[PDB]
Each structure stands twice: as structure tokens, then as C-alpha cells.
Structure 1
Amino acid sequence: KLNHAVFIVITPSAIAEKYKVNLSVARAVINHLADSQKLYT
């Protein structure tokens, strides 16, 4: 809903709620950790 910040476990909805970011930003956060319905398990 009001989630929008660029800068201030794995599951993108959970990341997006907890850190107050979009799921698009959450997927970016997952990729940053790592360094469609594709697995992250």
C-alpha cells in the first residue's frame, strides 16, 4: 500500500511488509542476498 522507500527469512511478501518496501524491491533484496514463480529455497 504505502510501501515505496529506495533507501532508509526469504519470502518476498514477508520482506516487503517487514522492511516496508515493494515486492519488486524485495526481489532486488533477494538478489542482493543471493550475490515467474522461481524458488528461493
Structure 2
Amino acid sequence: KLNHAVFIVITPSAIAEKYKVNLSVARAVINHLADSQKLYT
């Protein structure tokens, strides 16, 4: 049962496991911090 959200090593799964968040909001936060699957920088 899903309970994660966006309210509180930049890759999706790493950030998701760190912050206990959904993958979508994790990618959103990743783009927020930086600014289908692609090779890492």
C-alpha cells in the first residue's frame, strides 16, 4: 500500500531509497536539484 509523497548520488532508485518516496516524485526532486532511463553523468 502506497504512502510515499514528495514532502521530506542523484539517481532515481538511490534517492527513492534514501527519502522513502515514489519514483516519480524522486525524479521530480532530482530535476529540481540538478537544475527512458539514461546513462548517468
TM-score (norm 2): 0.69
Identify unmatched segments of 5+ residues in structure 2. Answer: none
1:34: how far off?
A: 2.1
Residues 2 and 9 of structure 1: CA distance in aligned 2, closer, same or farther (over 3 Å):
same
Aligned position for 2:14: 14
- How much identity, in percent, do the aligned residues show? 100
Identify unmatched segments of 5+ residues in structure 1. Answer: none
Query: 4+ runs of 1 displaced by more than 3 Å?
Result: none
1:15: how far off?
A: 0.4
The answer to whether the 8 A contact 1:3-1:20 is kept is: no
Higher mean displacement: 31-40 or 14-23: 31-40
